[PDB]
């Protein structure tokens, strides 16, 4: 196959486990579980191409370590997720982006910025500001809900399109 190796990164509670379980299994979860399953794999068709996604769902309240580096370094593209009702998570995006670049030892990594939990009202992270963030880094910005499935495909499939183009 062409495999696409995706790593989903970002802060505690942002919806990384849920976004991926929604893509790999087509259902929504809700369960305070810091465990991280082996990689999620799924043959899919993206823009007509049959391919294997292999998605590493990582941990949110974890400091950088060699162990985390050991897991992350195999990824080809990175989904950088915050929650639109969590300002800390959006600000932490800078760290996560900078961490990814250092781990991959590269000035140009395929990434997509994802603002998750779009179904929730009274958002705190202004949409325009995430677009400006994503723009200033030169990456796509997708808004998602692991709950309603809005954007879950756009977000991930765009990340595959960024791998192809790098
Ligand atoms: C330890 C773990 O930290 P974590 O594993 O780093 O956290 P995740 O980023 O994987 O977070 P998860 O996907 O489990 O989603 C967190 C909570 O928000 C809910 N959620 C996820 N996406 C959405 C969405 O789009 N909309 C709505 N309305 N809700 C959503 C989930 O059902 C869950 O209750 C963790 C940290 C903080 C909080 C929870 C948590 N957890 O395990 O559940
Ligand atoms: C599901 C879960 O998070 N736990 C079992 C850990 C204990 N709890 C309930 C916990 C830990 C940490 C934080 N936090 O610092 O954000 C919590 N906030 O609400 N419950 C928390
Ligand atoms: Mg999780």
UniProtKB/Swiss-Prot annotation:
S-nitrosocysteine modification, residue list: 118
Gene label: HRAS
Organism: Homo sapiens
Disease: Costello syndrome: A rare condition characterized by prenatally increased growth, postnatal growth deficiency, intellectual disability, distinctive facial appearance, cardiovascular abnormalities (typically pulmonic stenosis, hypertrophic cardiomyopathy and/or atrial tachycardia), tumor predisposition, skin and musculoskeletal abnormalities.
Post-translational modification: Palmitoylated by the ZDHHC9-GOLGA7 complex. A continuous cycle of de- and re-palmitoylation regulates rapid exchange between plasma membrane and Golgi.
Phenotype for residue 13 to R: In SFM; somatic mutation; shows constitutive activation of the MAPK and PI3K-AKT signaling pathways
Effect of residue 12 to S: In CSTLO and CMEMS; also found in patients with oral squamous cell carcinoma
Residues of this chain annotated as glycosylated in UniProt: 35
Record Pfam families: Ras
EC number(s) on file: 3.6.5.2
Short motif Effector region, span: 32-40
Expression by tissue: Widely expressed.
Activity modulation: Alternates between an inactive form bound to GDP and an active form bound to GTP. Activated by a guanine nucleotide-exchange factor (GEF) and inactivated by a GTPase-activating protein (GAP).
Protein's name according to its UniProt entry: GTPase HRas
Modified residues annotated as N-acetylthreonine in this record: 2
Keyword GTP-binding: yes
Listed GO CC annotations: ciliary basal body; cytoplasm; cytosol; endoplasmic reticulum membrane; glutamatergic synapse; Golgi apparatus; Golgi membrane; GTPase complex
Reaction(s) this enzyme catalyzes, per UniProt: GTP + H2O = GDP + phosphate + H(+)
Function description: Involved in the activation of Ras protein signal transduction. Ras proteins bind GDP/GTP and possess intrinsic GTPase activity.
Subunit structure, as described in the record: In its GTP-bound form interacts with PLCE1. Interacts with TBC1D10C. Interacts with RGL3. Interacts with HSPD1. Found in a complex with at least BRAF, HRAS, MAP2K1, MAPK3 and RGS14. Interacts (active GTP-bound form) with RGS14 (via RBD 1 domain). Forms a signaling complex with RASGRP1 and DGKZ. Interacts with RASSF5. Interacts with PDE6D. Interacts with IKZF3. Interacts with RACK1. Interacts with PIK3CG; the interaction is required for membrane recruitment and beta-gamma G protein dimer-dependent activation of the PI3K gamma complex PIK3CG:PIK3R6. Interacts with RAPGEF2.
